[PDB]
Amino acid sequence: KTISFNFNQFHQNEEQLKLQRDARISSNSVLELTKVVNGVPTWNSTGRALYAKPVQVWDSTTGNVASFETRFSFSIRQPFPRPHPADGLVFFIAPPNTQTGEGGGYFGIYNPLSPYPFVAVEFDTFRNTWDPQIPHIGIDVNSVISTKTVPFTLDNGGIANVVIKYDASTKILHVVLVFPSLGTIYTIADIVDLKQVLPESVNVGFSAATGDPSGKQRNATETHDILSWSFSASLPG
Amino acid sequence: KTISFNFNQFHQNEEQLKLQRDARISSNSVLELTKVVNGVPTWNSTGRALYAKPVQVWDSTTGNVASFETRFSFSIRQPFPRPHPADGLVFFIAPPNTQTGEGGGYFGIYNPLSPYPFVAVEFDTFRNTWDPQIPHIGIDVNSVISTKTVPFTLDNGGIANVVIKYDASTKILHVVLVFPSLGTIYTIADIVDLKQVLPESVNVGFSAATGDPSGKQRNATETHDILSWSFSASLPG
Ligand SMILES: *[C@@H]1O[C@H](CO)[C@@H](O[C@@H]2O[C@H](CO)[C@@H](O)[C@H](O)[C@H]2NC(C)=O)[C@H](O[C@@H]2O[C@@H](C)[C@@H](O)[C@@H](O)[C@@H]2O)[C@H]1NC(C)=O
Ligand SMILES: *[C@@H]1O[C@H](CO)[C@@H](O[C@@H]2O[C@H](CO)[C@@H](O)[C@H](O)[C@H]2NC(C)=O)[C@H](O[C@@H]2O[C@@H](C)[C@@H](O)[C@@H](O)[C@@H]2O)[C@H]1NC(C)=O
Ligand SMILES: *[C@@H]1O[C@H](CO)[C@@H](O[C@@H]2O[C@H](CO)[C@@H](O)[C@H](O)[C@H]2NC(C)=O)[C@H](O[C@@H]2O[C@@H](C)[C@@H](O)[C@@H](O)[C@@H]2O)[C@H]1NC(C)=O
Ligand SMILES: *[C@@H]1O[C@H](CO)[C@@H](O[C@H]2O[C@H](CO)[C@@H](O)[C@H](O)[C@H]2NC(C)=O)[C@H](O[C@@H]2O[C@@H](C)[C@@H](O)[C@@H](O)[C@@H]2O)[C@H]1NC(C)=O
Ligand SMILES: OC[C@H]1O[C@H](O[C@H]2[C@@H](O)[C@@H](CO)O[C@@H](O[C@H]3[C@H](O)[C@@H](O)[C@@H](O)O[C@@H]3CO)[C@@H]2O)[C@H](O)[C@@H](O)[C@H]1O
Ligand SMILES: OC[C@H]1O[C@H](O[C@H]2[C@@H](O)[C@@H](CO)O[C@@H](O[C@H]3[C@H](O)[C@@H](O)[C@@H](O)O[C@@H]3CO)[C@@H]2O)[C@H](O)[C@@H](O)[C@H]1O
Ligand SMILES: [Ca+2]
Ligand SMILES: [Ca+2]
Ligand SMILES: [Mn+2]
Ligand SMILES: [Mn+2]
Numbered sequence: 001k002t003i004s005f006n007f008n009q010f011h012q013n014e015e016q017l018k019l020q021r022d023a024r025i026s027s028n029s030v031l032e033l034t035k036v037v038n039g040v041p042t043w044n045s046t047g048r049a050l051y052a053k054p055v056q057v058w059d060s061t062t063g064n065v066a067s068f069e070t071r072f073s074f075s076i077r078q079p080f081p082r083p084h085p086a087d088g089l090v091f092f093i094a095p096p097n098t099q100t101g102e103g104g105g106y107f108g109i110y111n112p113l114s115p116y117p118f119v120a121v122e123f124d125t126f127r128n129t130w131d132p133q134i135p136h137i138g139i140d141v142n143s144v145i146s147t148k149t150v151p152f153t154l155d156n157g158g159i160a161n162v163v164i165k166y167d168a169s170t171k172i173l174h175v176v177l178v179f180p181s182l183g184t185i186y187t188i189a190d191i192v193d194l195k196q197v198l199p200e201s202v203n204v205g206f207s208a209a210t211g212d213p214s215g216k217q218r219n220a221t222e223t224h225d226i227l228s229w230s231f232s233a234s235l236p237g
Numbered sequence: 238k239t240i241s242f243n244f245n246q247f248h249q250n251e252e253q254l255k256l257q258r259d260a261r262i263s264s265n266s267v268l269e270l271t272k273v274v275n276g277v278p279t280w281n282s283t284g285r286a287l288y289a290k291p292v293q294v295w296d297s298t299t300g301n302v303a304s305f306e307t308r309f310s311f312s313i314r315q316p317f318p319r320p321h322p323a324d325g326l327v328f329f330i331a332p333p334n335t336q337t338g339e340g341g342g343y344f345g346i347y348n349p350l351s352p353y354p355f356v357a358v359e360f361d362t363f364r365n366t367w368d369p370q371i372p373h374i375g376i377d378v379n380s381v382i383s384t385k386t387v388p389f390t391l392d393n394g395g396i397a398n399v400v401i402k403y404d405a406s407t408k409i410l411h412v413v414l415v416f417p418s419l420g421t422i423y424t425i426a427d428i429v430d431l432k433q434v435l436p437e438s439v440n441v442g443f444s445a446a447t448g449d450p451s452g453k454q455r456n457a458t459e460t461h462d463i464l465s466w467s468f469s470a471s472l473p474g
Contacts, residue, residue, distance in 0.1 A: 148404075163422050174411050174426045185308075185400050189411045189426055 003055050006230035016052050018205075021100050021108070023047030031226040033089055033208035041079065043086075043211035043221040046103035050205035054096045055233055057202055058195045065168040065195050066235035070204070073227040076125065077157035080219040086126035089208035089224040090140070091164060093194070094118040096203045104212030105131075110144050117142050117197050121164055121175050125154065125222065126211075137177055139190045141197060152186040155179040159227065166194070204231060238303075238472040240292050245465055253289040255442075258337045258345070260284030267312075268463040270326055270445035277316065278458045280323075280448035283340035287442035288468065291333045294439055295432045296474035302432045304405040305470035307441070311463050313362065314394035317456040323363030325372070326445035326461040328401060330431070331355040333440045341449030342368070347381055354379050354434045358401055358412050362391070362459060363448075374414055376427045378434060389423040392416040396464065403431070441468060 005016065009029040019025070022035040022045045035045040058065045070091070078085040090107045094116060101111035105128035109118055122138040124131060130145045135154050138146030154160075163176040174189035211220025242253065246266040256262070259272045259282045272282035295302040307328065315322040327344045331353060338348035342365035346355055357377040364371045367382045372391050375383030391397075400413040411426035448457025 148407075161420070161422065163424055165424055165426075167426070170426070170428055172409055172411075172426045172428070174409075174424055176413050176422060176424050178415060178422060180417065180420060183398070183417055185398060185413055185415055187400055187402055187411055187413050187424075189402075189404065189407070189409045191407055191409070 002234045004232040005051065008228055018050045018052055019047070020050070021047040023049050031206070033206055033224040033226065034210045036223055041077070041210060041221045041223045043218050044103070044213050045210040045221070046100060046108040046208070048100055048108055048205055048207035049226070050203045051231070054201040054203055056200055056235055057093070057198060057233070058200050059235060059237055060200055062237040064235060064237050066233045067166055067168040068231070068233035069163070069165045070229070070231040071161070071163050072229040074123070074160050074162065075157060075225045075227060076123070076154060076160070076222050078125070078154070078222045080221065082219065083217060084126055084220055085222040086211040086215070086220040087209045088122060088124040088126065088135070089206060090120045090122040091162070091204075091206055092118050092120035093198060093202050093204050095199050096201055098203070100207070103209040104215070106144055107209050108207040115142070119173070119192055119194065119197060122146065123177075126220065137175060137186060137188050139173065139175070139188060139192070141192060148188055148190040150186060150188040152177055153184065155182050158182070166192075238293070238474055239470065241467075241469040242288065243467040247463075255287040255289055257285040257287070258283050260286050268443075270443055270461040270463065271447050273460055278314070278447060278460045280455050280458045281340070281450045282447040282458070283337060283345040283445070285337055285345055285442055285444040286463070287440045291438040291440055292470055293437055293472055294330065294435055294470070295437050296472060297437055299474040301472060301474040302405040303470045303472040304403055305468070306400070306402045307466070307468040308398070308400050309463060309466040310396055310398050311360075311461070312394060312396050313360070313391060313459050313461060315362070315391070315459040317458065319456065320454055321363060321457055322459040323448040323452070323457040324446045325360050325362040326443060327357045327359040327377070328399070328441075328443055329355050329357035330435060330439050330441050332436050333438055335440070337444070340446040341452070343381055343446070345444040345446050352379070356410070356429060356431060356435060359383070360414075363457070374412060374423060374425050376410060376412070376425065376429070378429060385425055385427040387423060387425040389414055390421065392419050395419070403429075
């Protein structure tokens with residue numbers, strides 16, 4: 001069939017969402033993935049938002065795979081330039097009913113203990129041992145070690161428009177990152193076989209994380225706000 | 238092996254540009270692919286601009302194929318809404334030393350009498366018998382009958398930002414079309430093996446065309462201006 005939803009803004013206690021950990025909805029409508037107290041982002045924070053109902057990316061009966069397009073706007077404000085903001089946010093697809101994973105450079109989607117598959121598009125702002133310079137957009141498959149990455153300069157506190165598109169017939173997952181205020185455009189694409197790494201039904205959502213305590217740096221933090229979000233998927237048959 | 242060039246604007250008879258047919262450079266720096274007399278675009282016009290030097294997309298010795306990224310800004314002003322603007326502009330890669338081809342729906346890159354391979358990204362503004370709804374972005378390979386197309390709404394006379402990127406390792410050619418004034422974003426991608434369709438050395442450039450006389454409609458016209466252009470290619474070879 002063909003599912004599709006769309007939030008032009010968020011309402012406190014959104015029946016259509018599942019907030020986890022530090023994820024909250026501010027009074028003025030934005031989805032704050034990581035904690036921010038009195039206008040200031042704190043470290044040691046991790047949160048995710050999933051769409052309440054599961055979506056079917058493929059049908060084992062027909063063998064068909066769904067194509068999808070999702071658009072969202074986010075904003076990352078980095079109050080403390082030194083020594084290094086962290087960690088970033090990601091959009092991900094995962095099995096339904098998963099639980100927040102490790103924080104820090106794992107964005108809360110990777111769980112070393114009990115690893116579950118996931119396809120995610122990351123917006124990394126802190127350089128871990130496995131990362132190339134930052135910030136960078138990355139395409140992750142079952143691992144936080146991106147298959148493809150591309151650098152980008154962040155518009156601190158500005159608005160970012162993202163477009164993620166998946167064409168099943170070509171298996172191409174292409175993402176676009178635009179900062180309207182700077183007129184800058186960033187693009188990245190890679191081949192991904194959803195049918196090969198994910199179950200027929202999945203959850204889609206966001207996950208973010210601020211500096212991990214082990215880094216011993218309270219400054220290692222930033223905001224991870226989601227302003228709007230629309231999703232559309234087509235599974236012929 | 239990295240080649241690259243940037244034009245933040247164009248100047249009267251530039252050293253590194255080969256203008257063909259109606260293509261000219263206005264006194265105020267824009268590259269006008271098709272004819273415009275006294276601020277008005279005319280029909281029966283065709284013009285191309287090629288980068289003076291040839292670029293190497295692949296080496297037959299190593300078998301390696303180059304990856305590349307090119308960005309440009311164009312503007313299409315359609316003064317006459319009825320009966321229909323035509324025909325559009327394209328960015329293309331082709332064997333070196335080619336001559337302008339047929340105009341009209343062929344954008345000046347296809348020559349029925351002496352065909353030559355070419356890879357192109359088109360912004361089609363007229364609907365020929367082989368065309369789907371217009372306007373649309375299309376990826377063409379040796380034919381003006383796109384392998385993949387996506388519709389888009391034009392910002393009449395507005396500025397358009399384009400980003401074309403080719404990743405050799407995945408063979409993915411992804412293009413992004415942004416209209417900053419409307420904040421709209423369009424994206425399309427397909428698999429293309431340059432090594433399979435083009436020679437080692439090629440020319441890169443633009444080509445446009447206005448209504449063909451056979452259409453018997455002088456209003457079938459519009460402008461095809463290129464404001465800026467940057468190109469970068471990397472051959473590991
Ligand atoms: C953590 O972020 C703090 C807020 O930006 C930094 O402190 C600020 O540092 C400025 C110069 O870097 C200085 O002008 C400000 O007065 C100060 N703001 C306040 C009132 O705290 C801090 O920078 C360093 O550490 C602080 C404690 C001071 O020693 C500064 O002189 C240092 O530059 C950031 N900590 C770091 C860099 O690890
Ligand atoms: C469409 O444009 C062509 C050139 O861009 C015209 O052909 C050229 O016309 C010139 C003026 O008539 C002539 O000096 C050139 O030799 C000739 N060269 C070419 C490319 O064929 C073409 O047709 C001409 O113009 C029309 C108006 C008639 O006068 C014909 O006899 C000419 O061939 C133009 N077609 C039309 C219908 O405008
Ligand atoms: C060819 O383009 C012309 C310029 O836009 C069209 O004329 C304009 O038509 C408008 C309504 O279509 C009218 O409000 C404008 O005043 C007029 N502008 C001028 C000075 O021509 C033209 O439209 C046709 O021809 C005109 C003279 C009228 O009879 C209209 O009813 C016709 O549609 C366009 N011709 C076409 C569509 O083939
Ligand atoms: C990072 O954030 C944690 C919140 O999830 C803090 O611990 C809290 O959660 C633990 C379970 O992991 C609970 O047992 C505690 O009640 C919570 N502690 C607090 C903040 O009230 C965590 O705090 C540190 O670690 C916990 C286990 C306690 O020892 C705290 O005193 C200690 O500060 C926090 N880490 C840091 C470095 O702040
Ligand atoms: O600043 C926040 C970041 O914290 C972690 O990043 C690593 C670095 O901060 C690194 C510094 O050398 O330290 C790592 O952990 C330490 C242990 O704490 C220490 O006991 C010893 O084992 O060495 C290691 C490695 O040096 C931190 O993991 C997060 O992983 C990162 O995402 C940021 O949030
Ligand atoms: O008006 C601009 C467009 O002109 C051509 O488009 C074709 C169509 O307009 C088509 C009508 O359906 O007519 C074609 O030409 C006619 C000949 O004039 C006629 O003698 C006979 O051969 O039939 C054909 C139609 O097949 C036009 O070519 C351009 O092709 C298009 O790109 C626009 O520029
Ligand atoms: Ca990281
Ligand atoms: Ca056409
Ligand atoms: Mn990364
Ligand atoms: Mn077309």
